[PDB]
């Protein structure tokens, strides 16, 4: 019953006090790792002796590395405890939580095994990006988040086809804007993929203003694009809200069945 006791402790933390305190320690270390990742990029100061303003992750590289390795050790010990104390280890490994944990902890091990090629450029940037995934471990630390996830999975097809319609609208508007605006002086509409940016910024009603039409036809089609974006701000809400509310009522009915 040891393995099942440990798995019961992990899966439902509130069942015990030791399990719940280990849960809170794990959540605290997740927050520490996220805050350290965010903070290590802040330029701390001039650091006299160096002209460039070094980030906190380079002026204090050893301290941040110690914090990161403590967090990664905690995460990997937790992962090994979960995997070795699961009713079905393969089912655990294939699960979304497990792959998130592995892809969160694994960049640290690549950085360890790339210590010989310390002059790596670009790949380590992708590894540090993938280190953002440690925030997703807060999914175990919420309940409405899983409700939203189930709602999204139930709206996967509808939202996918809505995105497909949005994509064809993007292509149409980008084509017309590129052809209407390719002739302007020093125009940013240098291609249709270049007008993808303008179209996606216009139909979301951002309007950064870096790419704006400068021709009469371009302005007319930009106005049509804006009006289409007004409807874009209302096309996903009905399906999403209706599906979420249906799930809400169904969950309440399940609760009353259990009661």
């Amino acid at each position: 019953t040891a393995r099942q006791r440990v798995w019961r402790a992990f899966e439902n933390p509130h069942t015990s006090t030791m399990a719940l305190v280990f849960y809170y320690v794990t959540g605290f270390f997740i927050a520490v790792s996220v805050i350290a990742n965010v903070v290590e990029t802040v330029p701390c100061g001039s650091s006299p002796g160096h002209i460039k303003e070094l980030p906190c992750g380079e002026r204090y590289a050893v301290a941040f590395f110690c914090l990161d390795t403590a967090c990664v050790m905690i995460f990997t010990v937790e992962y090994l405890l979960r995997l070795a104390a699961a009713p079905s280890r393969y089912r655990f490994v294939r699960s979304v939580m497990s792959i998130i944990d592995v892809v969160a902890i694994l960049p640290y091990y690549i950085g360890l095994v790339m210590t010989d090629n310390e002059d790596v450029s670009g790949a380590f940037v992708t590894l540090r990006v993938f280190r953002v995934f440690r925030i997703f471990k807060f999914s175990r630390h919420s309940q409405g988040l899983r409700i939203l996830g189930y709602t999204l999975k139930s709206c996967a097809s509808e939202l996918g086809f809505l995105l497909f319609s949005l994509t064809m609208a993007i292509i149409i508007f980008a084509t017309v804007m590129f052809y209407a605006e390719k002739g302007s002086s020093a125009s940013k509409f240098t291609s249709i993929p270049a007008a993808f940016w303008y179209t996606i910024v216009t139909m979301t009603t951002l309007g950064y203003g870096d790419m704006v039409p400068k021709t009469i036809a371009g302005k007319i089609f930009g106005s049509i694009c804006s009006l289409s974006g007004v409807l874009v701000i209302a096309l996903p809400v009905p399906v999403i809200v209706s599906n979420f509310s249906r799930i809400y009522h169904q969950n309440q009915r399940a609760d009353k069945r259990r009661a």
Copy 2:
């Protein structure tokens, strides 16, 4: 029964396997033509021997022309098969799908017959714009798109009058903004059609920022315009959503009648 067999194959592709595979080939060629049209405008590179960075559609003009003519041949053979194997050929020709197909394939034939006047300027740009219509042939490759089309046709009058009210609001706000802002130094509000752009960008809550008021009265009326745009982002949703939901329930009731 040959003509009716071919028309049954075309209209409902899933009835057979040959019809469905020809359907998927046609959809694949539609996607190929759309991607080629989007890509041919991307500047591929310096192309040594030419100072200007030529687009992919001009450095590799022969390859893109071969791809385009293969796609157009497939489309026109499909169109002839559909027209010659229809229960009512005139009804086919007048249909929206047929006119979309014709206006998609016809710019290629104009480009063929304009090969003598290869120095054409402007008209060929419009032809290449109208080549975007090949994306619309994906309408046959969706089911919710037709539901949205029927909903739009049922909301044609309501949305038309809503657009008319939006237009009168645009005219009013453009007039007041032009008269409040015509006196500024190097102002972009050079006319009321010039303020149409500012009004349509403001009431959609884009705010590009190229045209902003610089006078106190201009800023007051721009604030009123912004507040009106807040309501603009909510005026089409009730009619559109209510009509679409009514169509949804009516379709479900039709399904249950058939069941």
Copy 3:
């Protein structure tokens, strides 16, 4: 029965053919006057002999004046016919439609009586602004517009208090943004009324970008302002939509009572 016959012709145009054709002529002249007012500000061309690009309303001043006086004559004859053929003339004069008609036609008569002081500056600009009100005469040429007007009148108190809450939010955010951003170099936050513009542009999710915070505290409070604007885009919709739908159902019930 002459006066009542004329008033029946005016009030319900569809009752006859002469009344309906006079209605359509009046609507056509309203559209002509609106289009002429919009077009007279467009710079037509260089007009050789003058360096400045004169607007259409000044290069062709006599033609636009003739069109304007024809439109004003039609409008004032219509107004006199309505007033002299009304069941209660005072009730007509106090009505909103009558005041709109008078304030639309009256700037022309001021321009006539100000022909001696043709060098007027500023006041004539306000008169030309008030000439925009001729668009509002399209209210008689719609039915859903009156439904929206009744809905607005029924939501007058709720929308007024919502605007009051929006105003107190504007004042709070403008105060905090001004005090956080008054110290920046060449800052646009020169006063709290100056930050009114930033606050109203931010809580409507325009983001023109002319006034942006440049301090950390300013950016924090701008983020709070943006998040508040997200709720601003949803605070008027429930009251407006609920009231409009209640009016819709009540009108349908009235129709069924009459049936």
Copy 4:
């Protein structure tokens, strides 16, 4: 019965005429103080003899100080009357209205006791900011505002977790945008807290345009951020509206129970 008479006069102003007129005087002085605070920052003019354009609160410092001290005297006399004539003085002091009143009136007394250190910098700015809280005393002068406050208190947990999800989305998008855009020339994405601003401006569909991506990966992730903001403009509305409507129906049912 004196204390209870005074407290009944304060709590429900409409019970009497003296209580209601004192209520209206208090509201008028609140509006006077708010308008004076807003106006004292407006640059009145050149004020010959001084090169800088002094604000109204410094060219006319004595008049604004007299107005402010009259308003503060009225507010503190009202506060003492409320506290000394309350059924439970401690319950009054701990109440939200009381702390708002105290923090509104108290900056004036700090300014009095800091008259020796008149060269204070920064702290007095915070005091003048906290003087904005006098607007909140209009909470006693509304009824729907308390309905919104109760609705917010009932949605405190749901909106808090929604803000937490928005925060994790902000962190993820800021990380990816910083790492995609840190390499650009003179990029504003100098850190992840620096990209917090871009992310919060993008997911609210502001698009100021001061920080825009300049790399292909940055533009792709900015497009994803924009699409997420489209859903952000719809995630708080269902919970807020449903809770507010439930409170509405419950209040109507309470009214009918009392009837």
